[PDB]
């Protein structure tokens, strides 16, 4: 999806194996905020929010708590008290075509900054001046969503990057998204310390 209309998938009631993601060599950014990757495979969470979008190479740094920019203010805002991981990888092979891929958009103007985890899909003309826009993109009245022009011959700061942000929250409901606990080979007829289902 586009960054203005970022896809949110709610992940519940399953087993989340995070070591498959962490040990992959295909990811360029795996920056986790509020938690470390080593204890992800141990801890258990109530729900997982997977937000997916495409941004530029130079805009990956703005997907962080406390940052400022077009993406943070107008497209996708992260809270300061955010627990989760931001995973980004280059997708110049898929999301760039030789003619120019203009299927991706970004809200360039809004009257106020976004709240954390807010989605704005409105297509109303931004009013920068005192005169009413009246629905026409004339003087001082600009269209909010501006397209990205992805091409495969671009620089590394302009190449498309697919970003998946996983948000981990703990609520008073029973946490059901747990990691895969391993199973040490059962040994019989010896005095051993057993741990069966807790």
């Amino acid at each position: 999806a586009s960054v203005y209309a970022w896809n949110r998938k709610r992940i519940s009631n399953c087993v989340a194996d995070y070591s498959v993601l962490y040990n992959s060599a295909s990811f360029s950014t795996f920056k986790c905020y509020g938690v470390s990757p080593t204890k992800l495979n141990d801890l258990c969470f109530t729900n997982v929010y997977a937000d997916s979008f495409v941004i530029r190479g130079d805009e990956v740094r703005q997907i962080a708590p406390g940052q400022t920019g077009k993406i943070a203010d107008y497209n996708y805002k992260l809270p300061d008290d955010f627990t989760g991981c931001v995973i980004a990888w280059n997708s110049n092979n898929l999301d760039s075509k030789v003619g120019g891929n203009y299927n991706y958009l970004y809200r360039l103007f809004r009257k106020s900054n976004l709240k954390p985890f807010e989605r704005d899909i409105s297509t109303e003309i931004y009013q920068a001046g005192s005169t009413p826009c009246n629905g026409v993109k004339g003087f001082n009245c600009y269209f909010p969503l501006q397209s990205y022009g992805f091409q495969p011959t671009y620089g590394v700061g302009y190449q498309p990057y697919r970003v998946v942000v996983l948000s981990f929250e703990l609520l008073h409901a029973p946490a059901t998204v747990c990691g895969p606990k391993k199973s040490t080979n059962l040994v019989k007829n010896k005095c051993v310390n057993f741990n069966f289902n807790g």
């Binding site: 003087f139 001082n140 600009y142 501006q146 091409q151 011959t153 671009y154 620089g155 590394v156 302009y158």
Partner: protein
């Protein structure tokens, strides 16, 4: 809400769409240059028309924001750059006439073919047919024939066209609240609104005269030495007291004197510093040349080339089937896309050109953080000067020994430094009076100081006074002798070479003082010095956001262009020329004493 925020949002909806349209146009121009085919020409023309129409619409929309209600200097600079009418203030008929005049001058210059009367079955074009004759022949009347016949055909075609051109450009400039077109060209160096660092359009001519008055003794001694050597080469044509004949300078117009190095060499018996054979023996590919240039730029601390540079550049001639422009050009296509289009051979000249164009690429990469309309040099001189300093540094024997191209037991004595400095003076110092005379003549033509019936009588008078070059035979007003050159016939500014030449040695002194070099300035190499690269990159990162005076304060610590670094660079050569000119007469006479 406020006017300033409205202008900022307008500049952002400019910038974002502009970068992508400039990219499309630049990519179309690249595809034309690497593949000369008619559909690529059509795609280039369509992209250029879209780019020009988009610039017209944004110029039409930018003017509605008044300048005096904006206080931020960068926003005011971008709005000042955008709000220029250009040719749009002129009427559509006169604008179409001006465009037609420019196109027909382009066709006349590009397709101008001249050969000898009574032998018309085949003819030679300027490049490379006439260039090789001008650069290599030793015959007086053959060079005289080629020079007079090409200025006869080109001037007699272009004189009414230039007479229309000056009137149309003056009309456009006075419609844009300028005094003349010369003031429009001098407005590139105009700095307004900065306390102390302001620069005026009228100060440029005074600064050029002030620097050239100090240029003049060195050029007089060099001209006397070249006169004595050409008297040795041609016994009877050259007078001891007079100017040089025009067709003997080694090039078509007198732009460079670098083709007289064989005739005017001080010590022919001593060897040259030619490294061509060493690269041929070690089989140095053009890829290795660009990798060594990249090693030079990482040694000074500048960023290395992107992966897209190595993937997308054409550094070798494609073949017979595919046609490409042979001229080396660095392309900043936009959005972090940087390419070099050069048909690189295994020569010293192509290696220095590779360093020069990679310096252009480094300069383009440095201001990538800037907004789109501020992505330029602070003036037109800096952009070429940052490539010419790399051409200076790469040419040193220390750089050749460091990269292994020169033998470590090569003897660097004073005679090789003298003849190298003389070659650099014939390339660099010799273009300065021609450039100054051409720009001053064009400024007086646009200002109206010279009437149309008196253009050439003054012009040759200027050439005798400034360049010290006499016409072979007198020319009347049916000739148009300036417009045989590429830049003047195709509406290009010419003071960029003068400013580039002075900024080159100013930057060279600044970086060599930064690098703590303890010898002569021409023996200085800026490799291995992180602080010199940092001092360079501080100015390089600014782009057009800051005034060129403030950038020059950032580099050299001076608020104005200076002539003393050039004289310090050639000071051993200046003393050697003063020693060699004891018997001969320094200076020239403006009279017709050699030939007229």
């Amino acid at each position: 809400s406020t006017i300033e925020e409205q202008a900022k949002t307008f500049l952002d909806k400019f910038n974002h769409e502009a970068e992508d349209l400039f990219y499309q146009s630049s990519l179309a121009s690249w595809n034309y240059n690497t593949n000369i085919t008619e559909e690529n020409v059509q795609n280039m023309n369509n992209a250029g028309d879209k780019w020009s129409a988009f610039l017209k619409e944004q110029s039409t929309l930018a003017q509605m924001y008044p300048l005096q209600e904006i206080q931020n200097l960068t926003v005011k600079l971008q709005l000042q750059a955008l709000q220029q009418n250009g040719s749009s203030v002129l009427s559509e008929d006169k604008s179409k006439r001006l465009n037609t005049i420019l196109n027909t001058m382009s066709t006349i210059y590009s397709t101008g073919k001249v050969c000898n009367p009574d032998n018309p079955q085949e003819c030679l074009l300027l490049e490379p047919g006439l260039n090789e004759i001008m650069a290599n022949s030793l015959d007086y009347n053959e060079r005289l024939w080629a020079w007079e016949s090409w200025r006869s055909e080109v001037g007699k075609q272009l004189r009414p066209l230039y007479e229309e051109y000056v009137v149309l450009k003056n009309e456009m400039a006075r419609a844009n609240h300028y005094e003349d077109y010369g003031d429009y060209w001098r407005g590139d160096y105009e700095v307004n609104g900065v306390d102390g660092y302001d620069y005026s359009r009228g100060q440029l001519i005074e600064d050029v005269e002030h620097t050239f008055e100090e240029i003049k003794p060195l050029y007089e001694h060099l001209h006397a030495y070249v006169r004595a050597k050409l008297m040795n080469a041609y016994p009877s044509y050259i007078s001891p007291i007079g100017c040089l004949p025009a067709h003997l300078l080694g090039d078509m117009w007198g732009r460079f004197w670098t083709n007289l190095y064989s005739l005017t060499v001080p010590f022919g018996q001593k060897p040259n510093i030619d490294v061509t054979d060493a690269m041929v023996d070690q089989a140095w590919d053009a890829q290795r040349i660009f990798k060594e240039a990249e090693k030079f730029f990482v040694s000074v601390g500048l960023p290395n080339m992107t992966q897209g540079f190595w993937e997308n550049s054409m550094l070798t001639d494609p073949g017979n089937v595919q046609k490409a422009v042979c001229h080396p050009t660095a392309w900043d296509l936009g959005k972090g896309d940087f390419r070099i289009l050069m048909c690189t051979k295994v020569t010293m000249d192509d290696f220095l050109t590779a360093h020069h164009e990679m310096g252009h690429i480094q300069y383009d990469m440095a201001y990538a953080a800037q907004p789109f309309l501020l992505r330029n040099g602070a003036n037109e001189g800096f952009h070429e000067a940052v490539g010419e300093i790399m051409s200076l540094s790469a040419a040193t024997p220390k750089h050749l020994k460091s990269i292994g191209l020169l033998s470590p037991d090569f003897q660097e004595d004073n005679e090789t430094e003298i003849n190298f400095l003389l070659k650099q003076a014939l390339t660099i110092v010799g273009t300065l009076p021609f450039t100054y005379m051409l720009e001053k003549w064009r400024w007086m033509v646009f200002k109206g100081e010279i009437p149309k019936d008196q253009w050439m009588k003054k012009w040759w008078e200027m050439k005798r006074e400034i360049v010290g070059v006499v016409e072979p035979v007198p020319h009347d007003e049916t000739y148009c002798d300036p417009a045989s050159l590429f830049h003047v016939s195709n509406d290009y500014s010419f003071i960029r070479y003068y400013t580039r030449t002075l900024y080159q040695f100013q930057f060279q002194e600044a970086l060599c003082q930064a690098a703590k070099h303890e010898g002569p300035l021409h023996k200085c190499d800026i490799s291995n010095s992180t602080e010199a690269g940092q001092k360079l990159f501080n100015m390089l990162r600014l782009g057009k956001s800051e005034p060129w005076t403030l950038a020059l304060e950032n580099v050299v610590g001076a608020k104005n262009m200076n002539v003393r670094p050039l004289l310090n660079y050639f000071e051993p050569l200046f003393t050697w020329l003063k020693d060699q000119n004891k018997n001969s007469f320094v200076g020239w006479s403006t009279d017709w004493s050699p030939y007229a």
